């Protein structure tokens, strides 16, 4: 039958049918539990709101994210996320549909074990698969080779691919993405006096980060321009009607991607991670990689990140050699778009992990059948 692609990303879940270009079900992955005292009688209100329902009623809820840095912490919450995205949102029986899944590189293996166990026992499917997100992000681009910087909500990872072949020794992982940028923006918004402490206000700071922030092409010139004149200041309207204004915090927040020492972590920026990933490959296979930097992830939707990435790589690299940053405008759903491309192929139909094969091999064939 028609396959399902469910990128269960760290901040937003993108689920939909195979063969389509637009994901039918994009919704953030949160669990909203009540914290105040109910006085109304007649039920209707649940003990846990999941998805857009928790987003609408977020002012009376404690929000819990089931995924932290690409690792599922609360398995019951993530099970509720799977139940909501299968039965309530997409409205399909899982036991008549194959279902591709996505996972970050260098993950703990027992996390993959428990994903395979829950997906084969509770939400039992005829077939499923676990695949690297960067591979499917390259599969959206319509090319065979290139390096993918995928910066999600929990994991920013660099994976090179050469002639459709991942090099696992050159893959690196970096725990700096959109949730950490939201936390740093929540920290630096207290300079102007705008206090944000609740989990409900974290979504508002995330909305400010989505709507107003951008990557500075040159950091020190944007410091000079922001300190000189109030031309870069932009106003935002809160849901309670208060209008705030932010200045340099539009570009001091994504610069943590290029300067992680703002949030105290020792490791270098994403450009140096990409550059070290390319020297971790061999010398002759670098020729495609500089020509095929294909970004993905929602964190790469800032409208200054491609020119900055080209500038930083062209500064680091030898200049004998073409730098090309291939950023499609639909790079948020490129994991799901690549999944819908891959799941609609006959050659993939022999590579499914299935029920009976799981029954002989235990929940450990996902370490063998899936790379």
């Amino acid at each position: 039958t028609t396959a399902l692609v469910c990128d269960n990303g760290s901040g937003l879940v993108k689920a939909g049918f195979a063969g389509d270009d637009a994901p039918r079900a994009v919704f953030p992955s949160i669990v909203g539990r009540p914290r105040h005292q109910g006085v109304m009688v007649g039920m209707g209100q649940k003990d846990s709101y999941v998805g857009d329902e928790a987003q609408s009623k977020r002012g009376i809820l404690t929000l819990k994210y089931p995924i932290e840095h690409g690792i599922i912490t609360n398995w019951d919450d993530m099970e509720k996320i799977w139940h909501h995205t299968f039965y309530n949102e997409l409205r399909v029986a899982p036991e008549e549909h194959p279902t591709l899944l996505t996972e970050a590189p260098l993950n703990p293996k027992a996390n993959r074990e428990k994903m395979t166990q829950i997906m084969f026992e509770t939400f039992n499917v005829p077939a499923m698969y676990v695949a690297i997100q960067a591979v499917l992000s390259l599969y959206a681009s319509g090319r065979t080779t290139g390096i993918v910087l995928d910066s999600g909500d929990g994991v920013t990872h660099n994976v090179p691919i050469y002639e459709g072949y991942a090099l696992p020794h050159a893959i690196m992982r970096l725990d700096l993405a959109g949730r950490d940028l939201t936390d740093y923006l929540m920290k630096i918004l207290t300079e102007r006096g705008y206090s944000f402490v609740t989990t409900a206000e974290r979504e508002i700071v995330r909305d400010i980060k989505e709507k107003l922030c951008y990557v500075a092409l040159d950091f020190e010139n944007e410091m000079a321009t922001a300190a000189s004149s109030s031309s870069l200041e932009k106003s935002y309207e809160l849901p309670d009607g208060q209008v705030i204004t932010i200045g340099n915090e539009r570009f001091r927040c994504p610069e943590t991607l290029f300067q992680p020492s703002f949030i105290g972590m020792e490791s270098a920026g994403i450009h140096e991670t990409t550059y070290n990933s390319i020297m971790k490959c061999d010398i002759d296979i670098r020729k495609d990689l500089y020509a095929n930097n294909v970004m993905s992830g929602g964190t790469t939707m800032y409208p200054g990140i491609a020119d900055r990435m080209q500038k930083e790589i062209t500064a680091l690299a030898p200049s004998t050699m073409k730098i090309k940053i291939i950023a499609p405008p639909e790079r948020k759903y490129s994991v799901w778009i690549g999944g819908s491309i891959l799941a609609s192929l006959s050659t993939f139909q022999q590579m499914w992990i299935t029920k009976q094969e799981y029954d002989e091999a235990g929940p450990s064939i996902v370490h063998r059948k899936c790379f």
Binding site: A127, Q349, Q350, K355, E357
Partner: peptide, 10 residues
């Protein structure tokens, strides 16, 4: 053969 029986079952 197990994969062929699998794809015939499914």
């Amino acid at each position: 053969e197990r994969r062929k029986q699998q794809l015939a079952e499914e």
